[PDB]
From TrEMBL, chain A:
Pfam families: Cas_Csd1
Family annotation (InterPro entries): CRISPR-assoc_prot_Csd1-typ
Signal peptide range in chain numbering: none
Phylogenetic classification of the source organism: Bacteria, Pseudomonadati, Thermodesulfobacteriota, Desulfovibrionia, Desulfovibrionales
Keywords: Plasmid
Protein name, entry field: CRISPR-associated protein, CT1133 family
NCBIfam families hit by this protein: cas_Csd1
Automatic annotation (TrEMBL), chain B:
Keyword Nucleotide-binding attached: no
Name used for this protein in its record: CRISPR-associated protein, TM1801 family
GO biological process: maintenance of CRISPR repeat elements
A Pfam family of this chain: Cas_Cas7
InterPro entries recorded: Cas7_Csh2/Csh2, CRISPR-assoc_prot_Cas7/Csd2
Keywords for the protein's UniProt record, in alphabetical order: Plasmid
TrEMBL record, chain C:
Protein name in UniProt: pre-crRNA processing endonuclease
NCBIfam families: cas_Cas5d (TIGR01876), CRISPR_cas5 (TIGR02593)
CDD domains given in the database record: Cas5_I-C
Single biological process term from Gene Ontology: maintenance of CRISPR repeat elements
Classification of source organism: Bacteria, Pseudomonadati, Thermodesulfobacteriota, Desulfovibrionia, Desulfovibrionales
E.C. no: 3.1.-.-
Classification via Pfam families: Cas_Cas5d (PF09704)
Family: Belongs to the CRISPR-associated protein Cas5 family. Subtype I-C/Dvulg subfamily.
Transmembrane listed as a keyword: no
GO molecular function: endonuclease activity; hydrolase activity; RNA binding
Length: 415, 286, 220, 270
């Protein structure tokens, strides 16, 4: 890994972050010939301070067991490097991991670090802007599409930028992803990422530039910081800064969550928590863009005219009836039928409708007789439809939730 | 307790009427279903619990007839008892090793406890006692036809807590299945039994348990449930003579030609059993 | 003219970096050593040598992650006579304690290469040996699809589909871009007690040209 | 030593129902899935394990069918030992250990570069079409430690595949076998092991699994007679005509094999 060695060389001539301490073969990292070869390397800081979740003492290269040794050579001789190179290598890394200096962040399973090839403000900007808590004027600039220099011309977009993500197991250490792009390209892709995510907020207090750590949590079994699949954490981070497709595994993960969810009076929230949260909708929208190349709006589209999207709207309205009928409701059709209806419509919708009648009927006997307004809407929606489909493919099952989220919001805007 | 000397397989059928066979902890408390097809589901775990209960009831704790996964128990105490009865004291929570007399503490637990002897148990918890597999296995149960669960709204004329905030009634609800018919599969293997001592007497007990387990299970939410058929295949040697799926194909279930509309009784269906290959013999218990 | 062009592709590949042997991480691209290893899988005799000249990269770069259960140690040499002179069982128990090891892997997902190499006689070869005859044998086998064994992309669990090219090299994904790799493994010196060698790697037009590994100056 | 005299390739089909075929150490315990395609994935060591198990169980320490690698299925009994310049030792072990004779292994010490590779080789197995796992919540009536006791109950998790069909490829090299003595009787036993490998695998997690079809390609010559990657194309699997919506049974699919070149023979054992 040239990067670390060069980093240390860069600033070791400076009065900080570098200290002078420290057969014959070819030094791999430097490529030089006939230099002493180290038999073992200095240790790496573990623990909370160092790599979170690791052993107190950790290493990158180790050959403890016979199964790990090849061509009859032992210990670190399996990978020759000079003593000074190993020292500087380790030193740099150690320095970086220091929380005292703003160059570290934690994401689910893994700790991430970054640096610039040359001294630049980029380092500063990235630390917060990749996972939000000038602040956001440059964020709306990259989301809009304009170049970074526009807001800050000083930024030499030609400067190189490094990123590294590590995760541990016992005393041994692993690598999940690594990236080396330039400034210019790098935040261009980050801008693109934000565009896709854009959704109308459900409440005024919600995030506008959602933090990546926020989003991952939402997929957890019980919203716990653990229970996050280490594979999705690695996949989404690489997909963000490389600009490639999202991993295929992502969508059924989300849908699973929505199936498994139920309200939690035990948490004693004033509102009965929504199943299709602000965050979850955002993830679904983004996936349909890159992967499926669909068109989907930022807000409610009354002219969409698609069976999956229509049926999502329909479910919203008929839910509203229930809510009004029984203030302070026990459970709602959201808590039980939402998984069935979105996968297999023709088996459930028949009865759903029937129920709705009673709600309407009761709302019609009391004062405040605008069951009427809901009754019209149903009619309108229905007309566009020919038949209920028996089954829907996953791609059909995103659109249904988007139609529901948009239509439900539409009604909140009233009340 | 000598081990059995043949391979076995079996099929089971049972009904439900105006009841909830197994509540889902996530779906409020609706019956479990396949979201994509509407078919019903039952966990093997349920069946196992039923069996354990029946055994307990019938035997009343006779020697070698205790059950281990028992109401509100702290499990590691039984491991420490097994260790102590084997004259020894346990290792710490890491336990990457075997216990200090693996044979005696495992055999101590195998001997005394019936359900361990039958099913096995994960037991490398903080008091180690080793690990067991168990010779008897079974899979999920699936309804032959889609089901239509429905909800019922009910009242109570009294309240529990003094915070009445108003002396008044109280609402509630129920979930039921009008009717449904289920199928299940299971296996038994001699080599495993050899390792545990699973003996023929156990097997007869097992059959009886299967036949009658439901009868002692009445409750508010259950409704009416009962077993209807039971077919057992016996191989003629220590290792089988035909693939399992082939045998399960000999049993066929179809609606009686005269019936129409939604099914409502076991009379709506017809069941048929074919002819087994020479290496197997078919017998019907019930 | 002389030499051969061969094409190979597959769904999986892994060229383990020497440093990350325990926690496998693959090179960005095939190294020459694996290229030589593959060729000898079609035809080889003690009387000849293989020399690699160039590699063509035809697809973009992609990475994916995998995890597995593994073993910690190798099997020791037994003594036959004692074995039946005193009958004892022999085995390695996988499941027991520290024997069990878990290893991760980062690997490539979609690959395609064309490699240019030629033929050479070695000192051991007898006077009757000729490079052309072996080259023709290689051509026949490659056309027929025959082989001494199934080729692999690094590890035996990654088979490779191969073909013989009789025409022009197609274009490449980064035909108009240049890239830097840093130092990479050239080859392993078996004769001087298993000593590795390294060289500087650079990619432009998706073609990489290593120096000749037989050259003495590289052996320093 | 006498050995097979023809190259071989084979294809196998098997399916699962309401079970977990291969868990993921990484992603909690979810079944493996391909990020590229959404197809299910099963590694090959998982199958080699099974094969070893079945052979050990069936043969019960016959003269030349001992197995080296164990998982505490081991048993205590008398064992045969046929008797047989470390090449002498290498031959000796290869004579009476089957798994080494078929797959090969690595020893602790090498006089010089040298390998024991073995003639059999395999690859990953993948689904025919995308799969979506189910999630199951369960309860337990009891607790492990005295500490957690404070009525003494806890939740749990299960992962299941409603249904799935899998394919796998493999190769056999005659020239390698000639360096190990792998002979025909071994090949017949190998076919049998492939057919019946799942019949002893029953557990809590796996549900029901079984093999369905097995096609064998037998080559005319010591070396092959056609490119392998083209033979694998002759096999084609597609959904039955009437079948619609999610698959739930083997009857939902149709399988066909084209005509093979002249130099090879196509056999069906399942």
């Amino acid at each position: 890994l040239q990067a670390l060695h060069g980093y240390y060389q860069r600033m070791s001539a400076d009065p900080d972050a570098g200290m002078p301490p420290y057969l014959c073969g070819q030094c791999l990292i430097t490529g030089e010939r006939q230099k002493p070869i180290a038999q073992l390397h200095p240790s790496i800081k573990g623990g909370r301070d160092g790599v979170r979740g690791a052993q107190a003492v950790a290493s990158i290269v180790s050959f403890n067991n016979t199964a790990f040794e090849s061509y009859g050579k032992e210990q670190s001789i399996n990978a020759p490097v000079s003593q000074e190179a190993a020292f500087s290598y380790v030193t740099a890394l150690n320095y970086l991991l220091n929380p005292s200096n703003r160059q570290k962040v934690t994401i689910a399973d893994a700790t991430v670090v970054f640096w610039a090839e040359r001294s630049s403000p980029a380092e500063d900007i990235f630390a917060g802007m990749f996972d939000p808590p000038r602040m956001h004027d440059l964020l709306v600039a990259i989301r809009s599409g304009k170049r970074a220099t526009d807001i800050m011309p000083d930024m030499d977009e030609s400067v190189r930028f490094h990123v590294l993500g590590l995760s541990p197991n016992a005393a041994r250490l692993s690598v999940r992803f690594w990236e080396v792009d330039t400034v210019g390209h790098m935040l261009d892709k980050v801008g693109r990422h934000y565009r896709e995510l854009e959704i109308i907020p459900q409440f005024n207090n919600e995030q506008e530039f959602p933090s990546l750590s926020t989003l991952l949590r939402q997929t957890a079994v019980l919203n716990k910081t653990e229970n996050i699949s280490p594979v999705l954490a690695g996949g989404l981070f690489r997909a963000m800064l490389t600009g490639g497709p999202y991993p295929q595994s992502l969508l059924p993960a989300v849908l699973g969550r929505i199936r498994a969810e139920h309200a939690r009076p035990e948490d004693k929230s004033r509102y009965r928590l929504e199943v299709v949260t602000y965050y979850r909708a955002a993830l679904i929208k983004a996936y349909l863009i890159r992967n499926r190349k669909l068109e989907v709006p930022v807000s409610l589209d009354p002219a969409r005219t698609d069976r999956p999207y229509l049926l999502g709207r329909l479910f919203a309205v008929l839910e509203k009836a229930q809510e009004d009928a029984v203030p302070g409701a026990n459970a709602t059709i959201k808590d039980r039928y939402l998984a069935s209806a979105s996968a297999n419509p023709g088996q459930v919708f028949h009865m759903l409708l029937k129920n709705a009648s009673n709600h309407t009927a009761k709302l019609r006997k009391d004062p405040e007789r605008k069951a009427i307004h809901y009754e019209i809407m149903m009619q309108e929606i229905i007309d566009n439809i020919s038949d209920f489909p028996v089954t829907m493919s996953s791609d059909e099952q995103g659109l249904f939730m988007i139609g529901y989220y948009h239509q439900r919001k539409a009604l909140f805007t009233k009340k | 307790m000598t081990a059995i000397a043949n391979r076995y397989e079996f099929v089971l059928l049972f009904d439900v009427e105006n009841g909830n066979p197994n509540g889902d902890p996530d779906a409020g408390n609706m019956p479990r279903i396949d979201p994509e097809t509407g078919h019903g589901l039952v966990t093997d775990v349920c069946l196992k619990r039923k069996i354990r209960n029946h055994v307990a009831l019938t035997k009343e704790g006779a020697e070698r007839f205790n059950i281990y996964i028992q109401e509100k128990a702290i499990l590691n105490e039984t491991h420490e008892r097994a260790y102590t009865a084997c004259d020894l004291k346990p290792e710490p929570k890491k336990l990457p090793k075997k216990v200090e007399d693996a044979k005696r503490v495992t055999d101590w637990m195998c001997t005394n406890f019936y359900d361990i002897r039958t099913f096995g148990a994960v037991m490398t918890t903080e008091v180690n006692c080793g690990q067991v597999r168990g010779p008897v296995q079974m899979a999920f149960a699936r309804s032959v036809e889609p089901v239509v669960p429905q909800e019922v709204s009910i009242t109570r004329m009294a309240v529990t807590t003094k915070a009445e905030a108003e002396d008044n009634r109280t609402m509630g609800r129920k979930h039921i299945v009008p009717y449904g018919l289920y199928v299940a599969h299971g296996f038994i293997s001699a080599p495993l039994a050899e390792k545990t001592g699973f003996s023929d007497e156990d097997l007869t007990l097992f059959w009886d348990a299967l036949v009658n387990m439901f009868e002692h299970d009445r409750s508010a939410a259950r409704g009416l449930m009962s077993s209807r058929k039971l077919i057992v295949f016996k191989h003629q040697n220590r290792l089988g003579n035909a693939p399992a799926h082939k045998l399960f194909d000999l049993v066929k279930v179809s609606r009686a030609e005269g019936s129409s509309g939604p099914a409502r009784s076991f009379a709506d269906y017809a069941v048929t059993v074919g002819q087994a290959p020479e290496g197997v013999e078919v017998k019907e218990m019930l | 003219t002389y030499g051969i062009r061969l094409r190979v592709w597959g769904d999986y590949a892994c060229f383990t970096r020497p440093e990350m042997k325990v926690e496998r991480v693959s090179y960005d691209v095939m190294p020459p050593s694996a290229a030589r290893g593959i060729l000898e899988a079609i035809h080889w005799k003690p009387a000849i040598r293989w020399i690699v000249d160039r590699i063509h990269v035809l697809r973009p770069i992609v990475f994916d992650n995998v995890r597995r259960n593994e073993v910690s140690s190798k099997i020791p040499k037994p003594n036959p006579a004692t074995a039946m002179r005193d009958r004892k069982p022999l085995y390695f128990l996988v499941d027991d304690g520290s024997n069990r090891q878990q290893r991760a892997a980062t690997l490539l997902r979609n690959v395609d290469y064309v490699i240019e190499a030629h033929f050479e006689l070695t000192d051991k070869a007898g006077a009757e040996d000729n490079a052309g005859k072996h080259l023709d044998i290689f051509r026949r086998r490659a056309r027929a699809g025959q082989s001494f064994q199934q080729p692999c992309l690094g590890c035996r669990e990654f088979p490779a589909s191969f073909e013989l090219l009789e025409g022009d090299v197609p274009l490449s994904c980064y035909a108009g871009e240049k890239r830097d790799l840093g130092y990479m493994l050239l080859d392993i010196d078996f004769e001087r007690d298993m000593t590795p060698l390294f060289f500087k790697a650079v990619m432009e037009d998706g073609v990489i040209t290593p120096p000749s590994r037989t050259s003495p100056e590289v052996r320093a």
